[PDB]
């Protein structure tokens, strides 16, 4: 296909200088391209597609070619389905790696491969100038740049300009959300006349109208009570979707916004996924939350953090990675054929969202806003 979502494990140990790439190319460090360039020149020269092994999650889509013959420009552009809230202005930067490439033609073209990529936001457009280049091969160029996290989110458009309609042409934005999780957004070119071909990626505002949850008045009506165990599930996986069924729970909105007493709960279920018996690739769940630490009322330090967990199948048994800091946890359900995303009730006030990523499906769950 020319669209989809995919996962894989990333073990730097078995990646040629994985630690150095990650530290000097995927982490805001030296404000010059020399370090990352030296590393990439040696690694990609021996293994041209090395960077693919660094993407924990890969989400791609096909976007129609669009021409401007006046200048011989073959352009592709689109809105990547960012897995979660970029961040708050209080956050640092994110060093994303940009990759433009295409198939190597059997015959030497009328010119050398070329592509200019730019990430534009409301106020500024981030251009990947030649000063951003960390690697150039016959049919592939890699740029590096630091962007404020809050900008890397829905609203950031991606544009790639080529001088020929190169086959297999595509641009990819590698985005490290944490030191151990990298989400790659890809835009693959499809024929002009073609219609956009987005991947199965949705964004859902679980708590539309947060004031509805200020009290317990609607508890009974929403089916969020001690009797049901605070579980009002709704389907995320559309009718003709992959054979894995994902559902989200809207009841936690009460634990995030209610000032009325609520049933004591050992844990809340934010979402679950069934069908693991046939899933042959790992599952990732990223959470975005504020720190539960105490603030200064005069200057509330609102820094947004990101943590991703991973469920994998080891000899048929599914187990999860864990983190003392991460508010969410992944546990098998009533049977190994199901996984549940859990959280302690008391963590909801600071939980901004969680995202579910697995083969052919990506769901971004927002506990704020109405969109």
């Amino acid at each position: 296909h020319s669209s989809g979502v995919s996962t894989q494990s990333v073990d730097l140990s078995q990646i040629k200088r994985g630690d150095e790439i990650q530290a000097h190319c995927l982490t805001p460090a030296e404000t010059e391209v020399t370090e990352c360039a030296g590393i990439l020149k040696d690694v990609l020269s021996k293994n041209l597609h090395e960077l693919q092994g660094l993407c924990n999650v890969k989400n791609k889509m096909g976007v129609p070619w669009v021409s401007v013959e006046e200048l011989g420009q073959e352009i592709i552009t689109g809105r990547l389905p960012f897995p979660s809230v970029g961040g708050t202005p209080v956050n640092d930067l994110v060093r994303v790696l940009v990759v433009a490439e295409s198939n190597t033609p059997e015959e030497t073209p009328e010119e050398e491969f070329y592509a200019y990529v730019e990430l534009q936001t409301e106020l500024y457009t981030f251009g990947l100038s030649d000063d951003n280049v960390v690697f150039t091969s016959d049919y592939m160029t890699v740029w590096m740049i630091d962007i404020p996290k809050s900008y890397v989110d829905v609203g950031m458009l991606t544009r790639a300009t080529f001088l020929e309609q190169w086959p297999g042409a595509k641009v990819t934005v590698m985005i490290p959300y944490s030191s151990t999780f990298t989400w790659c957004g890809e835009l693959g070119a499809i024929s002009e006349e073609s219609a956009p071909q987005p991947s199965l990626s949705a964004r859902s505002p679980v708590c539309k109208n947060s004031a509805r949850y200020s009290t317990s008045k609607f508890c009974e009506v929403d089916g969020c009570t001690a009797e049901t165990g605070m579980e009002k599930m709704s389907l995320l996986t559309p009718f003709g979707g992959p054979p894995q069924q994902a559902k989200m729970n809207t009841c936690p909105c009460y634990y995030k916004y209610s000032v009325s007493p609520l049933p004591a709960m050992d844990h809340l279920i934010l979402a679950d996924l069934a069908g693991l018996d046939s899933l042959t690739s790992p599952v990732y769940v990223m959470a975005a939350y504020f720190d539960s630490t105490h603030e200064n009322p005069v200057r509330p330090s609102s820094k947004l953090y990101h943590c991703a967990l991973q469920m994998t199948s080891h000899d048929g048994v599914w187990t999860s990675t864990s983190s003392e800091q991460c508010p969410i946890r992944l546990v098998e359900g009533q049977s190994q054929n199901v996984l549940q995303v859990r959280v302690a009730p008391t963590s909801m006030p600071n939980l901004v969202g969680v995202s579910l990523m697995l083969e052919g499906q990506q769901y971004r769950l927002e506990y704020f806003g109405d969109h």
């Binding site: 009290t215 209610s258 000032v259 008391t346």
Partner: protein
């Protein structure tokens, strides 16, 4: 059948709409809390540390 408080109301309740009050005692709960019962029998969580809450309690204590 225990209920707890997960968030506090940052908004003071009119002392003429406060029926009574009680404190969270159960080890099942996560946060210290004052639960106000309104004249309409609805409960609301309040942070014991805020001054308006302790004046409400001082008032509710006097009318008993």
């Amino acid at each position: 059948p225990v209920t707890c408080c997960y968030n506090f109301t940052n908004r003071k309740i009119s002392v003429q709409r406060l029926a009574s009050y009680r404190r969270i005692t159960s080890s099942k709960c996560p946060k210290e809390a004052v639960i106000f019962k309104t004249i309409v029998a609805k409960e609301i969580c309040a942070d014991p540390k805020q001054k308006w809450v302790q004046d409400s309690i001082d008032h509710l204590d006097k009318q008993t």
